[PDB]
Design a protein around this ligand. Sequence first.
Ligand SMILES: *[C@@H]1O[C@H](CO)[C@@H](O[C@@H]2O[C@H](CO)[C@@H](O[C@@H]3O[C@H](CO[C@H]4O[C@H](CO[C@H]5O[C@H](CO)[C@@H](O)[C@H](O)[C@@H]5O[C@H]5O[C@H](CO)[C@@H](O)[C@H](O)[C@@H]5O)[C@@H](O)[C@H](O[C@H]5O[C@H](CO)[C@@H](O)[C@H](O)[C@@H]5O)[C@@H]4O)[C@@H](O)[C@H](O[C@H]4O[C@H](CO)[C@@H](O)[C@H](O)[C@@H]4O[C@H]4O[C@H](CO)[C@@H](O)[C@H](O)[C@@H]4O)[C@@H]3O)[C@H](O)[C@H]2NC(C)=O)[C@H](O)[C@H]1NC(C)=O
Ligand SMILES: *[C@@H]1O[C@H](CO)[C@@H](O[C@@H]2O[C@H](CO)[C@@H](O)[C@H](O)[C@H]2NC(C)=O)[C@H](O)[C@H]1NC(C)=O
Ligand SMILES: *[C@@H]1O[C@H](CO)[C@@H](O)[C@H](O)[C@H]1NC(C)=O
Ligand SMILES: *[C@@H]1O[C@H](CO)[C@@H](O)[C@H](O)[C@H]1NC(C)=O
Ligand SMILES: *[C@@H]1O[C@H](CO)[C@@H](O)[C@H](O)[C@H]1NC(C)=O
Ligand SMILES: *[C@@H]1O[C@H](CO)[C@@H](O)[C@H](O)[C@H]1NC(C)=O
Ligand SMILES: *[C@@H]1O[C@H](CO)[C@@H](O)[C@H](O)[C@H]1NC(C)=O
Ligand SMILES: *[C@@H]1O[C@H](CO)[C@@H](O)[C@H](O)[C@H]1NC(C)=O
Ligand SMILES: *[C@@H]1O[C@H](CO)[C@@H](O)[C@H](O)[C@H]1NC(C)=O
Ligand SMILES: *[C@@H]1O[C@H](CO)[C@@H](O)[C@H](O)[C@H]1NC(C)=O
Ligand SMILES: *[C@@H]1O[C@H](CO)[C@@H](O)[C@H](O)[C@H]1NC(C)=O
Ligand SMILES: *[C@@H]1O[C@H](CO)[C@@H](O)[C@H](O)[C@H]1NC(C)=O
Ligand SMILES: *[C@@H]1O[C@H](CO)[C@@H](O)[C@H](O)[C@H]1NC(C)=O
Ligand SMILES: *[C@@H]1O[C@H](CO)[C@@H](O)[C@H](O)[C@H]1NC(C)=O
Ligand SMILES: *[C@@H]1O[C@H](CO)[C@@H](O)[C@H](O)[C@H]1NC(C)=O
Ligand SMILES: *[C@@H]1O[C@H](CO)[C@@H](O)[C@H](O)[C@H]1NC(C)=O
Ligand SMILES: *[C@@H]1O[C@H](CO)[C@@H](O)[C@H](O)[C@H]1NC(C)=O
Ligand SMILES: *[C@@H]1O[C@H](CO)[C@@H](O)[C@H](O)[C@H]1NC(C)=O
Ligand SMILES: *[C@@H]1O[C@H](CO)[C@@H](O)[C@H](O)[C@H]1NC(C)=O
Ligand SMILES: *[C@@H]1O[C@H](CO)[C@@H](O)[C@H](O)[C@H]1NC(C)=O
Lengths: 770, 769
Amino acid sequence: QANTSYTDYNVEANPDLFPLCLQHLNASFPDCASGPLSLTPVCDRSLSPKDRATALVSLFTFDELVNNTGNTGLGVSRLGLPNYQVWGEALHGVGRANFVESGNFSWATSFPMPITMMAALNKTLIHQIGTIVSTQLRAFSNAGLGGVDVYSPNINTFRHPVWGRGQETPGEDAFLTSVYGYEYITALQGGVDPETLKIIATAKHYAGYDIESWNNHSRLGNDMQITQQELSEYYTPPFIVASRDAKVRSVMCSYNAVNGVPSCANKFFLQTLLRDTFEFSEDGYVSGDCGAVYNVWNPHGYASNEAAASADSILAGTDIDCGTSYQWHSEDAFEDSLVSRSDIERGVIRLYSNLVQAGYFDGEDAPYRDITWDDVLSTDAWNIAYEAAVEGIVLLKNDETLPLSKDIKSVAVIGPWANVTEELQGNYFGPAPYLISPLTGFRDSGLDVHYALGTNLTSHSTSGFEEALTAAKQADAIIFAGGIDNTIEAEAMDRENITWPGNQLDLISKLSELGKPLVVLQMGGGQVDSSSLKDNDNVNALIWGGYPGQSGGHALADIITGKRAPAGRLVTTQYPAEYAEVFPAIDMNLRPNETSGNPGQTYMWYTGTPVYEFGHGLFYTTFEESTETTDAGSFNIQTVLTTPHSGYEHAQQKTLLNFTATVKNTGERESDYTALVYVNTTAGPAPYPKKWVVGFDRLGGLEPGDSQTLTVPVTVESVARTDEQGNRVLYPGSYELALNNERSVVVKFELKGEEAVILSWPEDTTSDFV
Amino acid sequence: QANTSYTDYNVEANPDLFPLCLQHLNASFPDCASGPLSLTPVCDRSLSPKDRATALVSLFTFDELVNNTGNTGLGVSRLGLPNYQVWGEALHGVGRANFVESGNFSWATSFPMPITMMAALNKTLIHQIGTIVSTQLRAFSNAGLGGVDVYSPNINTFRHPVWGRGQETPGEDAFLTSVYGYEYITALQGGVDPETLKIIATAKHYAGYDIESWNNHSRLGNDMQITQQELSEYYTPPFIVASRDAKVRSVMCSYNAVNGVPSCANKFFLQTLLRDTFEFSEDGYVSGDCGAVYNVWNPHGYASNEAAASADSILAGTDIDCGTSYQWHSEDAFEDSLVSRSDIERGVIRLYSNLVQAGYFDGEDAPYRDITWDDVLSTDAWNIAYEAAVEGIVLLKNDETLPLSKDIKSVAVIGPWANVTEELQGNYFGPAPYLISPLTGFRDSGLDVHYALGTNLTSHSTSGFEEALTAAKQADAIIFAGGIDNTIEAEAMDRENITWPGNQLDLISKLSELGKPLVVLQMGGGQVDSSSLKDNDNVNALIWGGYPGQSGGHALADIITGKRAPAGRLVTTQYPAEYAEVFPAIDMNLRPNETSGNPGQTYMWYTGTPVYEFGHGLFYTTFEESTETTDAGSFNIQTVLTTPHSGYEHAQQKTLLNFTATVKNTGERESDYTALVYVNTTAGPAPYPKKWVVGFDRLGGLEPGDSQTLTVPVTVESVARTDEQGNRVLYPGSYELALNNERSVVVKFELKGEEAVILSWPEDTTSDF
Ligand SMILES: *[C@@H]1O[C@H](CO)[C@@H](O[C@@H]2O[C@H](CO)[C@@H](O[C@@H]3O[C@H](CO[C@H]4O[C@H](CO[C@H]5O[C@H](CO)[C@@H](O)[C@H](O)[C@@H]5O[C@H]5O[C@H](CO)[C@@H](O)[C@H](O)[C@@H]5O)[C@@H](O)[C@H](O[C@H]5O[C@H](CO)[C@@H](O)[C@H](O)[C@@H]5O)[C@@H]4O)[C@@H](O)[C@H](O[C@H]4O[C@H](CO)[C@@H](O)[C@H](O)[C@@H]4O[C@H]4O[C@H](CO)[C@@H](O)[C@H](O)[C@@H]4O)[C@@H]3O)[C@H](O)[C@H]2NC(C)=O)[C@H](O)[C@H]1NC(C)=O
Ligand SMILES: *[C@@H]1O[C@H](CO)[C@@H](O[C@@H]2O[C@H](CO)[C@@H](O)[C@H](O)[C@H]2NC(C)=O)[C@H](O)[C@H]1NC(C)=O
Ligand SMILES: *[C@@H]1O[C@H](CO)[C@@H](O)[C@H](O)[C@H]1NC(C)=O
Ligand SMILES: *[C@@H]1O[C@H](CO)[C@@H](O)[C@H](O)[C@H]1NC(C)=O
Ligand SMILES: *[C@@H]1O[C@H](CO)[C@@H](O)[C@H](O)[C@H]1NC(C)=O
Ligand SMILES: *[C@@H]1O[C@H](CO)[C@@H](O)[C@H](O)[C@H]1NC(C)=O
Ligand SMILES: *[C@@H]1O[C@H](CO)[C@@H](O)[C@H](O)[C@H]1NC(C)=O
Ligand SMILES: *[C@@H]1O[C@H](CO)[C@@H](O)[C@H](O)[C@H]1NC(C)=O
Ligand SMILES: *[C@@H]1O[C@H](CO)[C@@H](O)[C@H](O)[C@H]1NC(C)=O
Ligand SMILES: *[C@@H]1O[C@H](CO)[C@@H](O)[C@H](O)[C@H]1NC(C)=O
Ligand SMILES: *[C@@H]1O[C@H](CO)[C@@H](O)[C@H](O)[C@H]1NC(C)=O
Ligand SMILES: *[C@@H]1O[C@H](CO)[C@@H](O)[C@H](O)[C@H]1NC(C)=O
Ligand SMILES: *[C@@H]1O[C@H](CO)[C@@H](O)[C@H](O)[C@H]1NC(C)=O
Ligand SMILES: *[C@@H]1O[C@H](CO)[C@@H](O)[C@H](O)[C@H]1NC(C)=O
Ligand SMILES: *[C@@H]1O[C@H](CO)[C@@H](O)[C@H](O)[C@H]1NC(C)=O
Ligand SMILES: *[C@@H]1O[C@H](CO)[C@@H](O)[C@H](O)[C@H]1NC(C)=O
Ligand SMILES: *[C@@H]1O[C@H](CO)[C@@H](O)[C@H](O)[C@H]1NC(C)=O
Ligand SMILES: *[C@@H]1O[C@H](CO)[C@@H](O)[C@H](O)[C@H]1NC(C)=O
Ligand SMILES: *[C@@H]1O[C@H](CO)[C@@H](O)[C@H](O)[C@H]1NC(C)=O
Ligand SMILES: *[C@@H]1O[C@H](CO)[C@@H](O)[C@H](O)[C@H]1NC(C)=O
């Protein structure tokens, strides 16, 4: 929109936002002691948030209202209503506060990227970080340096491995992504629909958004063809969970179209589904992605101008425009009879319902108003970012090499990922209090370190090889830190392949033939084809370290030297190179279609051979896994569904059966243990998924000898499939619960009865209406 | 459904309900101090109503749930949750309580029917009557004799004059019907979205329902074709006001289909309009009219069986089935996977959200739990039934004959409405504490009475004629009491004509030839063609008495003797009889169409010549009417909508300007004065309405020589029209506010600027899918 020359947003993946949208605002709180509003209903603490918000907007002139239909809410000086910035970010720590150059509020804790947080498979870990981010976010708010709402979390799934933003997500599995959303949102908002909101959270991006730019398919003009079945079974569950169970107070609509219609002008998505089917809060508000309302016009061409795009987005259910479409066109839209003042007011009343519920009109004694810089120091000082990295690092391969022998007194650190700063933080990060590179990790672990760059991330020169080989000879063992970073994968930048970049592999190879202990760190969010490192016996060890944040190097060093043990596991498939070549990344169809070239997408449908599988992880010890009841027997569907469901809003929310096992440490070392429980079945229509996650746990501190019992509730909804109309359906038949990919322990069960619908999928009568 | 032989419900207008549906239930309160629920969250006053109802429904087995999806909620004995009857009535007093044979709770105050109540043009009276009914209803509830929800009020409009149930409505105008609704509902529920619901009210019948059976066109199979424009402009505004302004907790969906879809299976009506456009409470429930859900299958044929009809109605938004469709066919629907459990629980949670907010779970100490029979006696003592009748009686013709001259000491009371009991009460009525005939009216008034039946209401016989004529001659003045009653107009029974029944006119005529003073009383809800009474100069006076309730007699006599002066006005048109002959009554098109024979419907569109007019009424006195400013001047549409609207949810709720007159009693008798304020315009699209009510009021006790300020807020929204797509639009152009039908006072104003939309009307994507 603010382009200075012709820009084709069918190909360009970054909008040109006007400065008003990008303007950071100085936060203050309205005054209900003596300001113009003190004697009005908005300051009456005995009325609902909706009545108080409604009374507030009633005072505005139209000009003042429109100034507050955008993310950069300019306020109303006349009523002592401050400017308010809706655009906050908390992907993995405070992301978009008004950071001071130095001193107080110059940094906030930078936790690992979500792709790495999820790998820990510790639902409590995700919760605890949210609580920490939530507190730091409040410290910034209370020093007038931020809002009380953030555009987090990303609960899209890493469907296709090229996605430049898959690093922001809890991986390719809807079940794990759902649980991520629930724990983070409940942590951000300060409880399950609680009396006072701590921080207003925002599930993004709703929906069908999992491509930036692959082969010039710009997110801003993408129209994704998705079946009601896959929309229901895959693309929306995390949103259903955020909306229905986490009681998320906000949803951001995506840039893309789905079945002809941009998300933010999509009645079916916003009204029929989110509002009429997923029980989105009565007072909840929808925010456009920055520029998304403009995109309904340019380049989707769903609306013929920015005034019609504004009208179509408001009438569909987009409450706040991240952008300048509402602010600069909602007046045109009104004068052209495209919307009513009441339409434009609906979005603002909803926003301020949430701010009232966050104590915004309640003065200095309100909840959370007492949080200071000292709470950022104290919460950071817990070093949960270190802990998070230590739990989330994944061992893909090991032959006794790790941990490092008593013998190894010196070690050669090599590769483009050894000497790094902000590479640790992935994206949507704020200034961190420090950044410990892997190099600085090993120096601090007290081994003699010999550094050599060797190669740059995307180099074809051998210039650096000589110096690296000679450093590797000096030393007792080789740590090679390579992979990808945001120079390869970022927002507006999908990968065009899923292979290691440059000549990093060529260098790892030469280091293999030196009879030296060779450890490879594969870093980045997306997965790279490590097939060559798999079937090469001289590469001893392989670690996926994702994006491990402010203390990543202490974490990686401490895993390697065995000061801590790894238990993390992959939360995406590592596909072979050819996967990214054989069918287009903008084909949303998950089910294998031989005619098209689609081998089926995600662990659930893929009919080729992963290099490393979704769920794959290793430990510095061995586990004996087994169970009391290895056939939990039959259950009647009509019986399960027709008993009381005391404690649950929905019958299908109940535990169908526990998955139980015993897990004994039968190896050298103390360690944590992670489990991912899958189901598979021939129940329901063909085709059939291979398996699908229905739970996960992390057991802690298993000394050798020690046993702990793993207990994973399989809920009724978790084993239901989905029909051709999108209804979630319990089908009768034969089911197996398998522990990890090796199927350590198998509990079988039969669903007896007739089919039952547990969620009715509304018909889409609006998308293609004439 | 419960028919013992074939019944064609396309012609038969009464459903055959199974007894479970018709069963009265012994009301009681769950025990949150001691019962099974005491330990559960439904008994926790920290939580919202929705969280409590939800927790409650979470304890049920499916079977128990399914048993509580119909009006006759059989309860859950396992949790000590009593049976609960959703089917209460309070059209114009307590109507479906478990009345006892005699003693305490054997009657309730029976007010005049709504059609007369409205003719008073006293919105305060409508509110006070509703507060009394609310108090009496809670007295019945506290005694274990009724629920805390009622299927009231009827805010359909008396669109066509043959309608059997127009008697139940505030007449043919959408504005008056809106205000009636707002005042009755806010009175029933005990405020505007109050902390504790007094009585849950139910706006009916939504929507497009204003025919029973005319020409064998049965309400149960009628598929009415309505334009989005007229659906938005005429047929839904009272429901908009009930939902958005009064905050009604319940809405009844109608028996009929509109544009191919039964209302209780109408997603457009229940979700897109009522829930997504009209701001219906997020805890509000939709009740089906008794049988309506069955009717989706038989005879509409929208569903192909009663399980499918049940599924289709739950998924549209019909929460509670008055009937046995849900109770007996929900399981078949669930097992044939037409609905989830969760779909079936949605409706019951909504109902129980409302019962939680009515204090149903909060024990003996909650608000309204202390009301007793004592409170029925005192509210009835106030005699608002009598006041209401006095304010609602409409004087049509008069030549000074009325009031009755001090001379006249004896009177011949004649006609079929003279000696009556339950005719005073119209329909949907419980037992009265007493019923005062017109005949009893005159005996009590002190005059000597000469009663003669003359003729029966519907009669081909001259048998009683001579006896009546004798009574007349042997007396100073003749009072004829005639018209229609619920033997002509009732539920399931439209009229087939709009003319006086039998030979009442033939007899009235002969009574006029005796040159004694002759006063005529046209009774009933429907108007009846009195052109022959107008033109007959020997008919001194003509009164419309409607259905004046328990004290109708004392009201009519006190008006006629002059112990009280009338002020009421018709709230329907009195059409010529040909009106019911030229076009089919099933045509919903309000605008005149010359190709179809449609002269236009109601005062707003009627091209013909009413016998008497919507708003017509006379006083026992004369009035001088004037205003300082006859040109209010110019208002810019954009200016009016772009300023603050402090105190109002929507900008359009703001007063555009006050219509403002001076009214002086220039006659010999004290009177109340009633004003209807009409707008007419050349703005917006063609055709143009003749006019439409934007306001009304009634001023009290104007003694002769006294003057009073008439001040009627004219709201921005009340002068907005409606485009071809159904949008509510303020149009720029020329406007005039006229006082009463003679336009005693005309105030001009002009709307300048561009067309603004004040209500975006959603597109119907689901009806034709
Ligand atoms: C899965 O993930 C889990 C979640 O992350 C993980 O559990 C956590 O493990 C970590 C790492 O081992 C623990 O971290 C230590 O915590 C010590 C302080 O502990 C006390 O406070 C904690 C935080 O409490 C807040 O959050 C709770 C959880 O939501 C709330 O319920 C609390 O009310 C509280 O909230 C407050 O703040 C919030 C955010 O600001 C805010 O929302 C809220 O309103 C309120 O203001 C508690 O969690 C903890 O509770 C544990 O222990 C108690 C008993 O003490 C039990 O009753 C509990 O059940 C629970 O088990 C405590 O109350 C820190 O002292 C410690 O830091 C020191 O050591 C680290 C090394 O790790 C150093 O880097 C650091 O600098 C510190 O060193 C300094 O002090 C030491 C003193 O020993 C000294 O040696 C040194 O010289 C130096 O001076 C560390 O951060 C964390 O406590 C665990 N929390 C929870 C809840 O689980 C779990 O292990 C993982 N499990 C698996 C299977 O992987
Ligand atoms: C509103 O209605 C009145 C009728 O009450 C209209 O009055 C007519 O006006 C024209 C020109 O002003 C006169 O020549 C006619 O004699 C009037 N007719 C009658 C029957 O009074 C008036 O035009 C209408 N106003 C608008 C703005 O449409
Ligand atoms: C910006 O790009 C658009 C095409 O998306 C083009 O229509 C417009 O002219 C460009 N604006 C400027 C100022 O170059
Ligand atoms: C915020 O405050 C700073 C420091 O006083 C000031 O310089 C700046 O202009 C203010 N920002 C805005 C957007 O007004
Ligand atoms: C709206 O915002 C603009 C700046 O973008 C400002 O100049 C203007 O004063 C504001 N309008 C009103 C009426 O406050
Ligand atoms: C910075 O925060 C600290 C809390 O550790 C506080 O002592 C100090 O006053 C703050 N400094 C300023 C200049 O606000
Ligand atoms: C490592 O990176 C830093 C920071 O970008 C750089 O200044 C330094 O020269 C690099 N080299 C070594 C050997 O650390
Ligand atoms: C790596 O990149 C840096 C920055 O461009 C460059 O100066 C350096 O020489 C490169 N090193 C090698 C070994 O190519
Ligand atoms: C499979 O691919 C072919 C060609 O792309 C397509 O016509 C067919 O409909 C696809 N099947 C499905 C289930 O989409
Ligand atoms: C499942 O396990 C939980 C946790 O121990 C237990 O409370 C519950 O009774 C078990 N439910 C079933 C269905 O076995
Ligand atoms: C599930 O998969 C296992 C192996 O993964 C297979 O042997 C078994 O037959 C499958 N069970 C069902 C119910 O499909
Ligand atoms: C009742 O009427 C219906 C149709 O209206 C008919 O199908 C049914 O057979 C009748 N039932 C009995 C017992 O006659
Ligand atoms: C209501 O109570 C009466 C008197 O005890 C009893 O005869 C009657 O059966 C009860 N009604 C029901 C429907 O159980
Ligand atoms: C449902 O209602 C029937 C009466 O129509 C009754 O026999 C039965 O007890 C009820 N079922 C349950 C589970 O309460
Ligand atoms: C109505 O139906 C009856 C039989 O039910 C029939 O005899 C009569 O002719 C019909 N009447 C009209 C006015 O169409
Ligand atoms: C009837 O109501 C009166 C009101 O005063 C009360 O005293 C009396 O106790 C009641 N009678 C019965 C039998 O409840
Ligand atoms: C009025 O009619 C009733 C029967 O409806 C009769 O018992 C009563 O005596 C009548 N009164 C007179 C005065 O005829
Ligand atoms: C009027 O009807 C009643 C009851 O049917 C009957 O007693 C009486 O004979 C009728 N009277 C006349 C005058 O027709
Ligand atoms: C007028 O009536 C005729 C006759 O049925 C019909 O064809 C036409 O659609 C009607 N016109 C309008 C404007 O409704
Ligand atoms: C209109 O009249 C009301 C009637 O009481 C008065 O209070 C109000 O201030 C007046 N407002 C305007 C805009 O004339």
